[PDB]
């Protein structure tokens, strides 16, 4: 019977390692399920009988070869497996000698430290029971277990690396039942994948001196040369945060020359001429990231891949998408003043995203960057300071047809705080009005500057009392975007109230944007070179003070670039006089 | 359907995306939609089709999400809804698909994947915004969220046009429930000179076993003892 | 060069371009480097030296054209530095004398070097050290 129930667990053995190398994407994952029933069906058999000892390590050895394939299928381990462990370990307590697996472990290596000849396939248990912990991110009772299976006067070995190092597989893995892989080949991976996380977190949390010596660590060895890359590639951030760049750069060639996937190792490079201000370069890099990101197998076996975590936002490993790139691009070029180029960029943002829909979809940046109509606000801003108002235009306008349905109808205007308008529209008519003025029109002009304000003070933009949708978050609600909206429209409204010289106008739109947002100056110098106009002293000294004694956060981006752009450069030499 | 004893066994080469442990699936245009039990979470993937007449193929799996939401003889549903200007789906219209999604979905003319879940939660994604891979993985916090929790399983998502003076842009989203809790919703645009949602929870009678639609705003449901349609026109 | 293996496959780069011997290039970068250098001068000259050390053991370093570019150099050069070469069997004292074209020129500054270090003895004991050991050798 154990001839017949060993000779299958081979023969799926077999079926498993064939699949593996040869067949199509289909083919495999058939053979590969055929097998797991197989195995499935020959566990519950074994499990049927109140185990034997010489039935034992063939059990164990169909429980590891059952839980392998388990999780090289799903690409992630469980809990199931977890419970498949406690089984096992329940069925070797009870043919000599139940409450949770960390004392079943400590209880069945006191057993086998009795020496059952299947040391083997517990150490393999160990391995695989090792890498679910490992992947549920249960690393100090993993230190425990393997604490006891070597000496317990190595107790002050709290660091895993060390402790899995001295940890031996016990034998040279005589004819027992077929297996899949060795207790020494899940070691490799344990220890790479163990050092690569330790490294990635010592990174993150702001160590990454601690972190080479672990990363080296994943290169020496068993390490894919897709991990290789991702190695090189924390090095490349570590190196970068310390002040070394020439190192730095040395990792990155290393990893872009060995792989087939240099999405990250680029975003480190522009990361790093950030550092420096090569700004050329860092556009140069990131032009490339966008082509590269524009170009596009699974083995029945534990690979190092299938433990290694999702990466976070903080790593250097997190590449977005090409739309998500080339919207990196355009916005790193647009605080720098390369409108032109930015404006290029910006359409192209735009083209791939709404002309999408036949292809593949290519999505917007993510929900902690800019919602998808701040999108069209920062396409407008690098269109104005190009000078291609008529596009800046056919911007605000598509975008208003769009979404008119959601605009609120202003029926409050007759009716005259409570009713609701987010600040992505007030800021819409903002720009639809400042590209009137480089066109020439002064009473359309005011016209948008005033509707502008009239959304600003006659609708609250925060009214989150009713979650009625999927909403901006961050960058629409922002008192900061608030009062420096107010200003920037109170401006804008100003400056066309001085062109047609009703400074009395425009002296009441200063002096309400200095109530508004006291910490701009832009205000207070237009105020004050009115002042300096008609009646200069009192007024003028009297906030010359107040500055002073006054003396950014997170403000949106097509809004900070608003600012910039309509700003004088004889501001300070001004407000020194 | 062409197909090259009146019975026929499928071979196993008909298979594609063997994940074997998904649940529910729905299809769009070019695009589609699983939705696969795992451990506690369950995860909604996305994935093409090949619009060229190949092998019948997948393709790469274009993005995946956890439901983290949901912790579990009911399946749950999936139903997607275009807007208007973009098919075995629905459309609503504008105001509609401004009021229940937001602007992004607007704007990006983007469907949105509604799925039916044993909870009784309603739960929808937009599709455009699920794009991923090794290096980017989706956060469903951002990603996927939530319209309104029945307390009840989910039977049957449609939606109707009420107001009725093949691709009819309707003005009203429908459940069911197994108990009977409805939840019809729709644009109101009233008393505060503001955009709101007319949410209606009826209780209809017993055990619903299934739900339809038929044109002007006639729901054809079924309960153990009767066959019986509702209208909201 | 400033900042391990690393560093070897940036020099075999460099020669491979050039067509030059790694030694060549990484003698010339090394004294080019010591000029420059010239406490933590110590603890970068000892890196430098652990480099230097890895490329004597690669045979990427010819000694005899160090030599050269070092006595190239012959005004910044302190006598720690060459000491310091010769304890880490870098380059011999010996191998260095005898690689300069002018002899009565290395006599002089050997002369300058010597009456110096011997005021410099009287500074502080931890200086005087280093100082007896490297005058004994
Ligand atoms: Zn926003």
Same mark, same amino acid.
């Given at each position: 019977?154990?001839?017949?129930?060993?000779?299958?667990?081979?023969?799926?053995?077999?079926?498993?390692?064939?699949?593996?190398?040869?067949?199509?994407?289909?083919?495999?994952?058939?053979?590969?399920?055929?097998?797991?029933?197989?195995?499935?069906?020959?566990?519950?058999?074994?499990?049927?009988?109140?185990?034997?000892?010489?039935?034992?390590?063939?059990?164990?050895?169909?429980?590891?070869?059952?839980?392998?394939?388990?999780?090289?299928?799903?690409?992630?381990?469980?809990?199931?497996?977890?419970?498949?462990?406690?089984?096992?370990?329940?069925?070797?307590?009870?043919?000599?000698?139940?409450?949770?697996?960390?004392?079943?472990?400590?209880?069945?290596?006191?057993?086998?430290?009795?020496?059952?000849?299947?040391?083997?396939?517990? %150490?393999? #248990?160990?391995?695989?029971?090792?890498?679910?912990?490992?992947?549920?991110?249960?690393?100090?009772?993993?230190?425990?277990?393997?604490?006891?299976?070597?000496?317990?006067?190595?107790? @002050?070995?709290?660091?895993?690396?060390?402790?899995?190092?001295?940890?031996?597989?016990?034998?040279?893995?005589?004819?027992?039942?077929?297996? +899949?892989?060795?207790?020494?080949?899940?070691?490799?991976?344990?220890?790479?994948?163990?050092?690569?996380?330790?490294?990635?977190?010592? *990174?993150?949390?702001?160590?990454?001196?601690?972190?080479?010596?672990?990363?080296?660590?994943?290169?020496?060895?068993?390490?894919?040369?897709?991990?290789?890359?991702?190695?090189?590639?924390?090095?490349?951030?570590?190196?970068?945060?310390?002040?070394?760049?020439?190192?730095?750069?040395?990792?990155?060639?290393?990893?872009?020359?060995?792989?087939?996937?240099?999405?990250?190792?680029?975003?480190?490079?522009?990361?790093?001429?950030?550092?420096?201000?090569?700004?050329?370069?860092?556009?140069?890099?990131?032009?490339?990231?966008?082509?590269?990101?524009?170009?596009?197998?699974?083995?029945?076996?534990?690979?190092?891949?299938?433990? +290694?975590?999702? $990466?976070?936002?903080?790593?250097? *490993? %997190?590449?977005?998408?090409?739309?998500?790139?080339?919207?990196?691009?355009?916005?790193?070029?647009?605080?720098?003043?390369?409108?032109?180029?930015?404006?290029?960029?910006?359409?192209?943002?735009?083209?791939?995203? +709404?002309?999408?829909?036949?292809?593949?979809?290519?999505?917007? $940046?993510?929900?902690?960057?800019?919602?998808?109509?701040?999108?069209?606000?920062?396409?407008?801003?690098?269109?104005?300071?190009?000078?291609?108002?008529?596009?800046?235009?056919?911007?605000?306008?598509?975008?208003?047809?769009?979404?008119?349905?959601?605009?609120?109808?202003?029926?409050? #205007?007759?009716?005259?705080?409570?009713?609701?308008?987010?600040?992505?529209?007030?800021?819409? %008519?903002?720009?639809?009005?400042?590209?009137?003025?480089? *066109?020439?029109?002064?009473?359309?002009?005011?016209?948008?500057?005033?509707?502008?304000?009239?959304?600003?003070?006659?609708?609250?933009?925060?009214?989150?009392?009713?979650?009625?949708?999927?909403? =901006?978050?961050?960058?629409?609600?922002?008192?900061?975007?608030?009062?420096?909206?107010?200003? @920037?429209?109170?401006?804008?409204?100003?400056?066309?109230?001085?062109?047609?010289?009703?400074?009395?106008?425009?002296?009441?739109?200063?002096?309400?944007?200095?109530?508004? =947002?006291?910490?701009?100056?832009?205000?207070?110098? %237009?105020? *004050?070179?009115?002042?300096?106009?008609?009646?200069?002293?009192?007024?003028?000294?009297?906030?010359?003070?107040?500055?002073?004694?006054?003396?950014?956060?997170?403000?949106?981006?097509?809004?900070?670039?608003?600012?910039?752009?309509?700003?004088?450069?004889?501001?300070?030499?001004? #407000?020194?006089? | 359907?062409?197909?090259?004893?009146?019975?026929?066994?499928?071979? !196993?080469?008909?298979?594609?995306?063997?994940?074997?442990?998904?649940?529910?699936?729905?299809?769009?245009?070019?695009?589609?939609? &699983?939705?696969? /039990?795992?451990?506690?979470?369950?995860?909604?993937?996305?994935?093409?089709? !090949?619009?060229?007449?190949?092998?019948?193929?997948?393709?790469? /799996?274009?993005?995946?999400?956890?439901?983290?939401?949901?912790?579990?003889?009911?399946?749950?549903?999936?139903?997607?809804?275009?807007?208007?200007?973009?098919?075995?789906?629905?459309?609503?219209?504008?105001?509609?698909?401004?009021?229940?999604?937001?602007?992004?979905?607007?704007?990006?003319?983007?469907?949105?994947?509604?799925?039916?879940?044993?909870?009784? /939660?309603?739960?929808?994604?937009?599709?455009?915004?699920?794009? &991923?891979?090794?290096?980017?993985?989706?956060?469903?916090?951002?990603?996927?969220?939530?319209?309104?929790?029945?307390?009840?399983?989910?039977?049957?998502?449609?939606?109707?046009? &009420?107001?009725? /003076?093949?691709?009819?842009?309707?003005?009203?989203?429908?459940?069911?429930?197994?108990?009977?809790?409805?939840?019809?919703?729709?644009?109101?645009?009233?008393?505060?000179?503001?955009?709101?949602?007319?949410?209606?929870?009826?209780?209809?009678?017993?055990?619903?076993?299934?739900?339809?639609?038929?044109?002007?705003?006639?729901?054809?449901?079924? &309960?153990?003892?009767?066959?019986?349609?509702?209208?909201?026109? | 060069?400033?900042?391990?293996?690393?560093?070897?496959?940036?020099?075999?780069?460099?020669?491979?371009?050039?067509?030059?011997?790694?030694?060549?290039?990484?003698?010339?970068?090394?004294?080019?480097?010591?000029?420059?250098?010239?406490?933590?001068?110590?603890?970068?000259?000892?890196?430098?030296?652990?480099?230097?050390?890895?490329?004597?053991?690669?045979?990427?370093?010819?000694?005899?054209?160090?030599?050269?570019?070092?006595?190239?150099?012959?005004?910044?050069?302190?006598?720690?530095?060459?000491?310091?070469?010769?304890?880490?069997?870098?380059?011999?004292?010996?191998?260095?004398?005898?690689?300069?074209?002018?002899?009565?020129?290395?006599?002089?500054?050997?002369?300058?070097?010597?009456?110096?270090?011997?005021?410099?003895?009287?500074?502080?004991?931890?200086?005087?050290?280093?100082?007896?050991?490297?005058?004994?050798?």
């Amino acid at each position: 019977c154990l001839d017949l129930w060993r000779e299958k667990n081979d023969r799926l053995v077999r079926q498993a390692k064939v699949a593996q190398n040869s067949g199509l994407t289909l083919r495999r994952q058939q053979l590969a399920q055929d097998a797991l029933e197989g195995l499935r069906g020959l566990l519950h058999s074994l499990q049927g009988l109140p185990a034997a000892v010489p039935v034992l390590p063939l059990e164990l050895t169909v429980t590891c070869n059952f839980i392998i394939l388990r999780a090289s299928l799903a690409q992630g381990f469980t809990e199931d497996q977890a419970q498949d462990i406690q089984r096992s370990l329940e069925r070797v307590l009870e043919t000599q000698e139940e409450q949770g697996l960390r004392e079943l472990w400590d209880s069945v290596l006191r057993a086998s430290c009795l020496l059952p000849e299947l040391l083997s396939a517990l %150490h393999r #248990l160990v391995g695989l029971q090792a890498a679910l912990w490992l992947s549920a991110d249960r690393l100090g009772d993993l230190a425990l277990l393997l604490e006891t299976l070597n000496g317990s006067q190595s107790g @002050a070995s709290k660091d895993l690396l060390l402790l899995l190092k001295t940890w031996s597989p016990p034998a040279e893995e005589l004819d027992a039942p077929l297996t +899949l892989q060795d207790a020494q080949g899940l070691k490799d991976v344990l220890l790479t994948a163990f050092a690569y996380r330790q490294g990635l977190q010592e *990174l993150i949390t702001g160590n990454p001196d601690k972190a080479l010596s672990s990363l080296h660590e994943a290169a020496s060895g068993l390490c894919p040369r897709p991990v290789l890359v991702q190695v090189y590639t924390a090095l490349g951030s570590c190196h970068r945060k310390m002040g070394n760049p020439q190192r730095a750069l040395l990792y990155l060639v290393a990893a872009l020359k060995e792989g087939s996937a240099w999405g990250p190792p680029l975003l480190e490079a522009s990361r790093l001429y950030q550092q420096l201000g090569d700004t050329t370069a860092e556009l140069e890099s990131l032009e490339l990231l966008v082509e590269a990101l524009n170009v596009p197998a699974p083995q029945f076996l534990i690979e190092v891949e299938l433990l +290694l975590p999702p $990466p976070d936002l903080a790593s250097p *490993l %997190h590449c977005g998408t090409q739309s998500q790139t080339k919207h990196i691009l355009a916005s790193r070029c647009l605080q720098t003043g390369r409108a032109g180029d930015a404006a290029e960029h910006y359409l192209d943002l735009l083209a791939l995203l +709404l002309d999408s829909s036949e292809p593949r979809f290519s999505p917007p $940046p993510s929900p902690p960057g800019p919602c998808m109509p701040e999108v069209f606000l920062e396409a407008a801003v690098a269109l104005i300071q190009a000078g291609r108002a008529q596009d800046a235009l056919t911007l605000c306008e598509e975008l208003l047809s769009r979404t008119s349905s959601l605009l609120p109808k202003m029926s409050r #205007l007759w009716e005259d705080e409570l009713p609701y308008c987010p600040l992505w529209v007030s800021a819409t %008519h903002l720009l639809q009005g400042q590209a009137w003025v480089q *066109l020439g029109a002064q009473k359309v002009a005011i016209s948008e500057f005033s509707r502008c304000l009239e959304l600003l003070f006659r609708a609250t933009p925060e009214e989150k009392e009713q979650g009625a949708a999927f909403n =901006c978050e961050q960058g629409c609600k922002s008192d900061a975007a608030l009062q420096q909206l107010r200003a @920037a429209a109170l401006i804008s409204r100003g400056l066309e109230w001085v062109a047609s010289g009703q400074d009395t106008k425009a002296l009441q739109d200063f002096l309400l944007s200095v109530q508004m =947002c006291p910490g701009n100056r832009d205000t207070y110098f %237009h105020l *004050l070179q009115t002042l300096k106009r008609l009646d200069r002293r009192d007024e003028a000294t009297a906030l010359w003070w107040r500055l002073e004694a006054q003396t950014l956060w997170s403000l949106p981006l097509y809004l900070e670039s608003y600012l910039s752009w309509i700003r004088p450069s004889d501001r300070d030499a001004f #407000l020194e006089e | 359907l062409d197909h090259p004893s009146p019975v026929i066994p499928v071979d !196993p080469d008909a298979c594609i995306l063997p994940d074997a442990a998904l649940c529910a699936f729905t299809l769009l245009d070019s695009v589609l939609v &699983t939705l696969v /039990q795992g451990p506690a979470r369950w995860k909604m993937q996305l994935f093409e089709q !090949p619009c060229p007449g190949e092998d019948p193929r997948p393709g790469g /799996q274009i993005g995946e999400v956890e439901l983290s939401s949901y912790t579990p003889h009911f399946l749950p549903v999936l139903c997607s809804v275009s807007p208007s200007g973009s098919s075995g789906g629905f459309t609503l219209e504008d105001a509609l698909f401004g009021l229940l999604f937001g602007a992004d979905a607007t704007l990006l003319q983007s469907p949105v994947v509604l799925c039916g879940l044993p909870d009784g /939660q309603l739960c929808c994604v937009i599709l455009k915004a699920l794009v &991923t891979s090794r290096s980017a993985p989706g956060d469903p916090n951002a990603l996927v969220k939530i319209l309104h929790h029945l307390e009840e399983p989910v039977i049957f998502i449609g939606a109707l046009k &009420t107001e009725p /003076q093949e691709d009819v842009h309707c003005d009203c989203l429908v459940a069911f429930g197994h108990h009977g809790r409805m939840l019809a919703i729709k644009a109101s645009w009233d008393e505060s000179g503001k955009l709101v949602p007319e949410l209606r929870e009826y209780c209809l009678p017993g055990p619903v076993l299934c739900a339809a639609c038929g044109g002007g705003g006639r729901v054809y449901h079924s &309960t153990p003892s009767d066959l019986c349609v509702v209208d909201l026109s | 060069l400033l900042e391990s293996s690393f560093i070897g496959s940036a020099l075999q780069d460099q020669a491979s371009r050039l067509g030059v011997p790694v030694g060549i290039l990484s003698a010339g970068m090394v004294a080019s480097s010591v000029g420059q250098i010239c406490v933590e001068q110590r603890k970068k000259l000892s890196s430098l030296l652990e480099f230097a050390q890895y490329l004597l053991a690669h045979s990427m370093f010819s000694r005899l054209s160090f030599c050269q570019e070092l006595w190239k150099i012959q005004s910044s050069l302190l006598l720690e530095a060459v000491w310091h070469l010769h304890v880490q069997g870098i380059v011999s004292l010996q191998e260095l004398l005898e690689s300069h074209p002018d002899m009565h020129a290395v006599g002089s500054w050997l002369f300058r070097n010597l009456c110096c270090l011997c005021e410099q003895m009287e500074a502080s004991c931890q200086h005087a050290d280093v100082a007896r050991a490297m005058l004994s050798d």
